[PDB]
């Protein structure tokens, strides 16, 4: 599930990917979008700064991708 095309503008490609965040080496960091049943997206494709990403990973707050974040939630 690491080499999926996470969104319309996804920049991660198994043929070109390289580490960006300090926590990455051979695979792209990813975060789950809680919209509906939910789905995984690449953190970098969401323009998330490393500290924001790490904070999200260290808490229980849900994340919503740039495509679903404005959708009225419930």
């Amino acid at each position: 599930g690491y080499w999926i095309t996470c969104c319309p503008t996804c920049d991660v490609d198994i043929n070109t990917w390289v580490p960006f965040y300090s926590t990455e080496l051979n695979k792209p960091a990813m975060i789950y979008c809680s919209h509906g049943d939910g789905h995984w997206v690449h953190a970098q494709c969401m323009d998330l700064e490393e500290r924001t990403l790490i904070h999200l990973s260290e808490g229980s707050n849900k994340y919503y991708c740039n495509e679903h974040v404005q959708i009225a939630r419930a």
């Binding site: 080496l25 960091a29 990813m30 975060i31 789950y32 990973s57 849900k62």
Partner: peptide, 12 residues
């Protein structure tokens, strides 16, 4: 939020 590859690698 659930994440992947957000763990700090050892060598410190």
């Amino acid at each position: 939020a659930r994440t992947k590859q957000t763990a700090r690698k050892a060598a410190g």
